[PDB]
């Protein structure tokens, strides 16, 4: 316990309410990724969320949404981190979860993981997104 404001930001942005991440949160997390202390707290909490159990699949989905935004709008260090920690992302391409209503929620995790890894393989695409999004990279 005892959180920096960045830690509260990233936790709130990846919490187990609904899988949709606020635009507010994403913009602030991308801005904060350029700060050294913030970057590590952001990436470490994101790693924890990704590693959560199936019941908390919303933690995983939202973490992946945050990671996608970060590599598209955040510090180059976010891309670096992903490549160093690609394994957890890649395994999530096959994550599975059916909820108590019989709904395939795991497909949400799988699509986000598959998008992120596809993007990370597509240097042309990621480079142009980042040039476009980041003034002046």
Swiss-Prot record:
Location within or outside the cell: Cytoplasm; Membrane
Occurrences of domain ENTH (ranges): 4-130
Family: Belongs to the epsin family.
Quaternary structure, from the entry: Interacts with EDE1 and PAN1.
Physiological role: Binds to membranes enriched in phosphatidylinositol 3,5-bisphosphate (PtdIns(3,5)P2) and phosphatidylinositol 4,5-bisphosphate (PtdIns(4,5)P2). Required for endocytosis and localization of actin. Negatively regulated via phosphorylation.
Protein name per the record: Epsin-1
Organism: Saccharomyces cerevisiae (strain ATCC 204508 / S288c)
Portion of the full sequence shown: 17 to 150 of 454
């Amino acid at each position: 316990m005892g959180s920096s404001s960045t830690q509260v930001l990233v936790r709130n942005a990846t919490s187990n309410d609904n899988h949709q991440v606020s635009k507010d949160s994403l913009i602030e997390l991308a801005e904060k990724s350029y700060d050294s202390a913030d970057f590590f707290e952001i990436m470490d909490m994101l790693d924890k969320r990704l590693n959560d159990k199936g019941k908390y699949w919303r933690h995983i989905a939202k973490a992946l949404t945050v990671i996608d935004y970060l590599i598209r709008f955040g510090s180059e260090n976010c891309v670096l981190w992903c490549r160093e920690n690609l394994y957890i992302i890649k395994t999530l391409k096959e994550f599975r979860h059916e909820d108590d209503e019989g709904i395939d929620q795991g497909q949400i995790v799988r699509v986000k993981a598959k998008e992120l890894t596809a993007l990370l393989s597509d240097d042309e695409r990621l480079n142009e997104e980042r040039n476009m999004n980041i003034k002046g990279r």
